[PDB]
Subunit: 446 residues, 4 copies
Amino acid sequence: HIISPFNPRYRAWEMWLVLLVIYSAWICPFQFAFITYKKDAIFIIDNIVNGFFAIDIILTFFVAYLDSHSYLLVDSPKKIAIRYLSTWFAFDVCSTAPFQPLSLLFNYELGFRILSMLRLWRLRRVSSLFARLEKDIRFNYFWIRCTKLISVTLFAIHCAGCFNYLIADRYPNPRKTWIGAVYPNFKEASLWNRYVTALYWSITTLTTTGYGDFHAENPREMLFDIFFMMFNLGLTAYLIGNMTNLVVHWTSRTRTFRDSVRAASEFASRNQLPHDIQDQMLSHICLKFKTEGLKQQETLNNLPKAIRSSIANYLFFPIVHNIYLFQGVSRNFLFQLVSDIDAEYFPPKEDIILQNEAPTDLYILVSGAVDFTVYVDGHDQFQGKAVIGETFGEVGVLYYRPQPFTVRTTELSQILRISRTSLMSAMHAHADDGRVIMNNLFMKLR
Amino acid sequence: HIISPFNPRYRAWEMWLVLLVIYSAWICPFQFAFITYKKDAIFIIDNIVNGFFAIDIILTFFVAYLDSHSYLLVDSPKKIAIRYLSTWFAFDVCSTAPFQPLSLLFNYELGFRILSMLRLWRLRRVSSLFARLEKDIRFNYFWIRCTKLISVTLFAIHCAGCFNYLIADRYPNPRKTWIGAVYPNFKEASLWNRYVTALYWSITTLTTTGYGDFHAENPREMLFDIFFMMFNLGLTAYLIGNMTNLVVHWTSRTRTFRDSVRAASEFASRNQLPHDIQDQMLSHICLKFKTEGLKQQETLNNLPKAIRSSIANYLFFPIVHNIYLFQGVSRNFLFQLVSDIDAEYFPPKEDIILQNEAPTDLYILVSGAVDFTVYVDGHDQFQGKAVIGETFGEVGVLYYRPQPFTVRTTELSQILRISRTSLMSAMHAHADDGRVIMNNLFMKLR
Amino acid sequence: HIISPFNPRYRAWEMWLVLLVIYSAWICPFQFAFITYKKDAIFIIDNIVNGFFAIDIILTFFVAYLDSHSYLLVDSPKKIAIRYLSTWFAFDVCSTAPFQPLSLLFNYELGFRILSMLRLWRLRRVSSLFARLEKDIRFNYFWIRCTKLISVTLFAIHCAGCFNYLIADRYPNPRKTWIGAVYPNFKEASLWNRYVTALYWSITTLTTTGYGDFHAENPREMLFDIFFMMFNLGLTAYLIGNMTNLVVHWTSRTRTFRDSVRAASEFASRNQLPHDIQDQMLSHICLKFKTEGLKQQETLNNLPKAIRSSIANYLFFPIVHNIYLFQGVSRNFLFQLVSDIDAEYFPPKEDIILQNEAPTDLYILVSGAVDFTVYVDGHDQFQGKAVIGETFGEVGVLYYRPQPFTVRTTELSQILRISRTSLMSAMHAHADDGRVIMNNLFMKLR
Amino acid sequence: HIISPFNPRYRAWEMWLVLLVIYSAWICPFQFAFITYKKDAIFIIDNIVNGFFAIDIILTFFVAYLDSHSYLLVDSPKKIAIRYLSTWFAFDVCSTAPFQPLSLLFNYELGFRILSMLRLWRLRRVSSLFARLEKDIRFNYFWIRCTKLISVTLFAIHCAGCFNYLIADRYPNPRKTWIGAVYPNFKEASLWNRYVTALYWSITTLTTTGYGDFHAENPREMLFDIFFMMFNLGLTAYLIGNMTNLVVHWTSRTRTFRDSVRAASEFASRNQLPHDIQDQMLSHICLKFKTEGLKQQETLNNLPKAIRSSIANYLFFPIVHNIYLFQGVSRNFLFQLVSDIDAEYFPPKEDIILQNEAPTDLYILVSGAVDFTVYVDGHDQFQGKAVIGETFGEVGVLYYRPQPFTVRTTELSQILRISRTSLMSAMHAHADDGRVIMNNLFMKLR
Ligand SMILES: CCCCCCCCCCCCCC(=O)O[C@@H](COC(=O)CCCCCCCC)COP(=O)(O)O
Ligand SMILES: CCCCCCCCCCCCCC(=O)O[C@@H](COC(=O)CCCCCCCC)COP(=O)(O)O
Ligand SMILES: CCCCCCCCCCCCCC(=O)O[C@@H](COC(=O)CCCCCCCC)COP(=O)(O)O
Ligand SMILES: CCCCCCCCCCCCCC(=O)O[C@@H](COC(=O)CCCCCCCC)COP(=O)(O)O
Ligand SMILES: CC(C)CCC[C@@H](C)[C@H]1CC[C@H]2[C@@H]3CC[C@@H]4C[C@@H](O)CC[C@]4(C)[C@H]3CC[C@]12C
Ligand SMILES: CC(C)CCC[C@@H](C)[C@H]1CC[C@H]2[C@@H]3CC[C@@H]4C[C@@H](O)CC[C@]4(C)[C@H]3CC[C@]12C
Ligand SMILES: CC(C)CCC[C@@H](C)[C@H]1CC[C@H]2[C@@H]3CC[C@@H]4C[C@@H](O)CC[C@]4(C)[C@H]3CC[C@]12C
Ligand SMILES: CC(C)CCC[C@@H](C)[C@H]1CC[C@H]2[C@@H]3CC[C@@H]4C[C@@H](O)CC[C@]4(C)[C@H]3CC[C@]12C
């Protein structure tokens, strides 16, 4: 018996009202200044529009809302009328109520047009849409906000141009007005010439060009220009502020990358490192930026540490499920195993593990070739290998001994890292470490 | 015997002085240029205003202040005169002292008007108010500062317009001035036409429009325009800077939210997660933003860790006071218990606790339904439940064993979390853990 | 059989195309408005340019690209045509296709010039270059982006000026146009005068000056100015946003330094420290800023903790290799030793180690003199020394006893710091600590 | 034999050169356009200025500099000539060399004035001063940078005005120039009228007003305005960027404070806390902001942890030196004791320690009254006290028992905090804890 605020009916009703509001807001100054009122072909359409909003006044009592403290619903139509009658009812029933149609049919005009300028309270619904669409996900945020600013700027042009043409009509002596002193016969021309002339006056003093045509002579008009140029100063400052937000935010990523590269280059050229350490640092920052892992670190560390477990369970479980070491290790162990795996990504020709380094982490390959050569003991050649899926670092499992070989990449790779302390934290989950240790003993003895 | 600076008398005295300062600052250029001086109907009011400030000069010796290093008072009127006589006394006694009324009554004028332009030192009190109202809590900060800028801009318009009308009066050959070459008979017109014309000239070169009327011909006036247009360049840059602060600060929250959603969507569409993990991540960020917990985390972690204990004592003590487990647990234990409770809030249909997960935390419901179904062992149906107030996670109290069921939400909930390490930290507070363990044994055996 | 996208041939082919695109984009409005078409001396060059792009349409099928998910290559020409035929093929084959040369040779003009305005789709390659050069390392980032903005601004001036000269030619009554009412005989003048006049009109309404010459009289031209001044408002806001990024980013370092100095001075002058502690704090921040160690800390702590080991191995191994203590300590121990050394840098006259201070760290000198004097027990003189390479702090190795002397610098120095906990972490690497302890015993006994 | 770069002689020599550079840069356009050259009264002064710079060319070989990698000196005049002859020698010896005085005395002019426009290379010294004064401590940073921008803007006005007056002189037909068509007789007027007219033209198109006088008619002049208005667009954007930095940086502190208060008020009014917890949170943030402890925390935690020990040794040693507990505790213990003391500051009426709270920290008063009342057991009245210097919290030294009383402030205080873990860390420093424990036993037994 109560209409939910997420039906397909009510949302299409709102968007039909939004098109109707845009119609009313475009007509109202153009009706206020140029055209007369006694003819009725637009009077019909205005009365129909007032009928639609009078229907909406009734129908907003049947609609549920979303409360702030308790969520997802408010029903039982008490407190709905308390919400609607306190916040938005008074100005809506002032705006919806016809006054010109009663003045026309009762006895009878300028004081009745000002009562028709209250139709602009209907323009809150466009603000409610541009509040919804920023916060909705499935839209470009830097498109909606510039659309909002273009809407406000175009409406300011329109309303100011029509009001100045009004104050040019109502004044005796057509000469010494802004349009009279240039065109001496202007009331006999069409609507398109007068409307384009008023619009052209208004935009040359909004966008602060100000050629020198169409300046003011009438002192009341000379008074209107003071308030309009104050308003244009304020709005132009606001517009430059929004475009500064769009430019600062659109290019933050590339600027932060170039900061990191400048800092690495100053640190390198200060201490005079030869070539190799420079190329390692700069290529490693280039491949941190091509796979943008900084936002990955932040947004993974903002997750509630169970959804990241389901992420790693999707990504790395069939890779860890088939290794040299792990054979029969009881997948209910693997669910608690997988969730601490921290992926990584590595440049080519970066010496990963050097000879006689004290061990720190397991390096499961997921892709990419690896080339191992003797370091210090062997001047050149020798042997060293590992292929997709084939782990290494299995010396420092429990042997606690340094790595035999050198580890230099050939083509780029993706290397998982279950480190030493993570392994020793996995040690207390016993009765399945026996299978791992049997795989170690039968692994190395063969 | 010494007036405190927080009386209701002295604050109303200051605000009466602020209205008097605004009066003096509006009159002084308008008196300096347009009107004469020999008539006395405003001379009376100016002498009365000088009387009020001469009273304030005496009365500021009886008032205490707030020192910088030691707080809350300085009394004993030594060092009050040392403060007042060193900082603000000289220019105040130069500004308050009448010079035109002595020139009028002594013997007698342009050199005496410049001595009346020193009345603008009285305008420090408006700066003191706009320093107080930013730092006071009970006002909108983005309203006060724009009011300050509108005040400075309007006063610049006013003073520049009146000074240019002065330099147009004092020059012989009324033609070849800015107002003379357009209106040849301008000294015979009223005050309102000349004042609106001067104001209209001034605003078309402050807001950089510059139509082309009212340009300068007199070379001293052509010299005045150089300094005024330098000043307008500086002030327009300052105004755009302040509106950039208001726009960058007004929309930081929505922009940060949309950053987080873009980063989550790039991380999802890079690694090709199917649907479910995307919808979990995006709905969890949407319900971190509807209940803005990031500012909550920051401002709770900036608190001195006793007021947050009183906060949690108000919020969660009658909820934890009535549980399945806790029955007679000696509320002086509960005061030390409650202060480490970390609240949280959760989306619907997010699988909270999965089957055979190694346990981490207690999950006391505060609201919201919970639905538990068999995971892996059971393909569908089965049973699992918990209602408002009914805790779960009571397996991993001391049993250290994985959870039996799956835990999926149905409608959204608020779930407290006293985690495993927090429980084991609460273990050393003994002689009341016996009641908890008896409640465990009689709880599970039934 | 497939051309790689990193050959020297294909890159020079692209840059030749970029010069050809700049040629076409400069000619096309200037051809559209000023000159005729029936003569053929430029028609030849345009057909040759269309030939070059028709060659490029074929040749872009033989070129490999870089995929997003898997890196470094895509070969095997399937999916290359799927990439190229879906993204960029349609507008390229619309732009490359000649239509004016077919209109000239088939039967025959304004509707055929608009088909020649589609040559501006060729201007995507300039956007691809200005996307590459920001992300490439070996270029100044704040030079490329301002070059991009100057390019867009100059092209807007050019195209708007030529389009307004077109709409001034095509209109009957040469008077009441923008160039007709000032120059009554303008079609008989040269190209340079008309082109400079159109360019001069366009820039006085792009850069919002607007003298007052050359305003519009024709109502269709009065309509064109509305769209052009809207566009200029948008572009001027965008340009101010980019220069705000350049100014905020160019002076962040000096502003952060001056923040730190202001905060230290307020903390000093609040609590009334005499002189010495002020000069120590301020000189220490000055020598943190002359050797900018903050970016060093950040970018070293962002490194993957093996490249920083190779850095410290290059920088400090021949310094630690020759000390009082270390003599025969088996350089495979030294590789694991060096990587935890944290360098530092110190001001002169800063009291480094005071008398009877509980010990915290080893202080190996690398440069700079050190002067030690008796503290408290000795009023003045006494003795204390250490020279380049000569360590101190060797009391608190295992003796766990306070330092004997005071340590005040004379000229500035660079002092390594292997702290107490780092030494005790190095203790478990035994069978070579015996040599260190023998060097201690024979060191102190002599 | 080598002049140090920090003598009082050489710095005064540099500042005399800076005044001479400002003289040359102001004269050079004004000499280039307005005045003739054959008279000699300024020719003398120019030759003298060239003599001063020819002396400086020699004298810059005797001066030491500061190297980048090794600091504080470079002597031994090899590599000084390598620095000076590579970087700055060529353009200095091109600028210093006279060419007009040789043209005047050799045989003989426009091509020789362009050789005199190379005197503007001498203007690097003003850039070196405005690089030094930002980085020097004893100057306001937001004053120097705005002075730099005003200097560049005024010089742009000056040079552009004089160059346009040159291109107005050199053209035949004095009518159809910018100054000719308004003043038909302008070459017969003085210097002040022509100079003010050129300056007034230049500033109305720098500050984008553009009245409508003084527009261009000569096509070469119409070409000059294009480059000058491009330059003014660029410089106006740069100026707005710098004022945006000054406004964003000048009001960051108050804006951050108001952020914290808005976040606390939203967190309070969301969860509906009654009054008391709101007033505690808001008054505690107000007294974190009146004594700005956030910058204190940052800049103390950036200190090298020995200077902060000397700070706490100056601030708190004679306060801790005289307590209830500590009597004879051997001040060489006190030097290691004091350095971990963390000061704090507290609002009035904030309940500091509640009844039956599990203890956390010692609370030595340094000022401010304290009022203790019974909590829960006692409804009202009771007793509780502590005065300046009199510690409390001495229950939980080793008794590990909750506090007896409640602790509510009356007037604001400053309370040191040596916490529980800091005390237990001080426990291993024995052979003087016996005196503390004797003071405990004789303290409580009395
Ligand atoms: C041709 C006819 C077209 C008709 C269709 C157009 C009608 C659309 C109408 C939408 C209106 C809602 C837009 C809104 O809500 O107003 C923004 C605020 O506007 C300002 O800047 C006002 C600064 C004033 C300048 C100071 C005055 C100086 C004294 C919110 O911006 P926010 O900060 O994002 O909330
Ligand atoms: C019609 C009559 C109305 C009379 C009533 C109005 C009187 C009110 C009067 C209030 C005055 C106090 C306002 C203040 O204090 O001046 C701000 C600073 O102003 C600037 O920008 C000055 C930039 C100059 C431009 C460089 C010059 C270029 C060479 C502080 O701003 P802050 O940074 O927030 O402190
Ligand atoms: C004399 C002849 C010279 C011919 C050579 C010049 C041709 C070069 C041509 C390069 C073009 C690529 C440059 C680009 O891509 O367009 C930037 C975006 O431009 C804007 O600002 C457009 C704002 C519109 C204002 C709103 C309109 C208001 C309704 C990207 O900027 P981004 O943000 O960095 O990506
Ligand atoms: C009346 C006679 C007075 C004579 C005395 C004055 C002589 C002083 C002369 C000082 C000069 C050094 C100042 C400097 O170095 O130039 C700043 C940079 O200037 C710009 O903005 C240039 C933007 C160009 C706009 C793009 C052009 C668009 C195509 C550094 O600013 P920075 O970023 O802080 O380094
Ligand atoms: C002189 C002339 C330029 C005046 C134009 C000013 C407009 C910018 C004014 C006229 C009516 C105003 C609208 C009417 C009230 C609206 C409801 C409010 O919840 C949001 C702002 C809201 C949408 C206003 C925005 C600003 C408007 C559109
Ligand atoms: C050419 C014309 C535009 C000059 C107007 C400049 C004004 C903006 C000047 C004139 C007098 C100045 C005021 C007088 C001194 C005031 C005391 C000081 O503690 C705060 C600034 C303070 C309030 C000044 C602000 C700027 C004012 C109001
Ligand atoms: C009224 C007149 C000023 C219009 C000029 C507008 C120009 C600024 C428009 C005209 C053609 C447009 C270009 C054509 C399409 C181009 C491909 C796109 O991938 C990047 C933008 C891209 C390069 C456009 C940038 C903006 C241009 C250059
Ligand atoms: C059209 C007219 C407005 C041209 C004026 C442009 C000036 C802004 C140019 C003219 C000469 C230029 C100066 C000459 C070279 C100087 C050395 C360099 O290390 C710092 C910039 C440096 C100081 C330049 C700054 C910009 C100046 C002062």
